[PDB]
């Protein structure tokens with residue numbers, strides 16, 4: 001009497017499974033898998049057996065599982081050298097959870113007003129460097145803008161001014177260390193891998209220096225770094241500069257390409273839909289004539305723009321595979337998923353289920369008005385994941401993007417360099433953004 005298990009896609013290659021076809025187009029693949037096998041569908045990545053949970057029901061099973069059924073550890077094994085050993089997600093389930101819990105208040109509530117001012121200020125700042133008119137690569141602009149605003153808010157002014165050029169190069173070497181051989185996490189050593197390892201060492205050095213310099217000086221700035229210094233375990237014991245360095249890098253990687261890509265898409269989508277450029281522009285111009293400046297209070301209630309960002313995240317979730325190891329038999333929609341196996345959510349797929357998002361392929365922000373399609377189901381729309389391990393900085397992300405767009409749109413008029421339909425997702429990236437050659441034209445407003 002064997003229990004009903006989920007269907008397995010007729011395999012491809014012996015030691016490769018489906019990996020090449022999947023790798024060709026991860027999204028197209030997962031769409032195809034679901035379309036042919038339904039809510040719960042097994043495929044093989046190398047040796048390993050992945051199970052795609054799509055739809056409201058199967059998504060709930062995923063996001064609500066205890067940390068003791070589904071472990072996010074292996075998904076991050078490529079990151080461990082960058083984050084440090086035993087720092088966060090390499091740490092024991094209970095220790096990992098305290099570190100994450102220390103971040104949450106750093107990225108919500110009280111510091112949010114300060115972050116707003118810093119982010120607004122940082123964009124206003126760089127915008128003074130701009131010619132009257134010109135052509136820029138939109139993706140590069142939002143990646144620069146995001147790393148500046150992030151690092152200022154998360155690390156502090158030290159890393160924007162005094163440690164600017166030093167940090168810039170560390171982050172590069174850190175970023176460059178994200179190579180899928182390390183993602184297997186099988187062998188750590190290589191030329192680029194040491195330049196990665198050297199980078200983390202030098203950052204932990206820079207951190208401790210600033211810890212010590214901010215302590216003998218009675219500087220008290222508002223940043224995640226400062227709050228991680230002031231945080232403490234339930235022990236009463238404190239974070240070591242190893243941990244503080246690990247958590248700050250995790251936060252920056254978690255927030256950088258995700259935000260930068262989304263800001264790009266919010267501008268692209270607004271620039272190929274004049275209808276919505278007007279609704280957003282009218283909202284901003286209204287915001288200024290009611291506040292005379294971009295202000296934490298003003299950013300809070302931008303319904304037009306919130307709705308646009310929400311639809312952009314429906315059509316363009318930057319993270320499209322959320323992977324977990326099954327370390328306990330749990331059951332999804334009747335089908336039993338064996339321990340030792342892998343499960344994963346696919347925001348990009350579930351977001352196009354017609355039963356959840358009527359006319360899924362149509363861009364319509366008005367889905368997210370009081371007669372909504374994001375509220376009355378919590379495991380439909382899932383761009384920020386869900387459950388115990390949902391994004392800590394969804395609030396930060398929303399303000400970051402609302403601020404950048406507000407300022408850019410208020411000072412500058414934009415128009416696409418190439419044909420509107422030519423702007424496509426590049427699903428072959430670890431974090432999905434628009435295609436690399438993503439040019440745009442600016443000219444000072446009025």
Ligand code: HEM
Nearest residue numbers: 100254255258259319322383384385389390391392393397
């Ligand atoms: C802007 C668009 C963003 C999107 C779409 C996004 C999406 C996500 C998703 C889907 C996860 C869960 C991954 C998983 O379940 O394995 C996640 C986790 C996380 N995100 Fe984001 N994120 C964004 C921005 C940010 C920003 C700006 C920050 C911080 C500044 C941030 C910090 C985090 C952290 C710390 C986690 C780990 C939460 C945990 O596992 O407990 N994210 N994000």
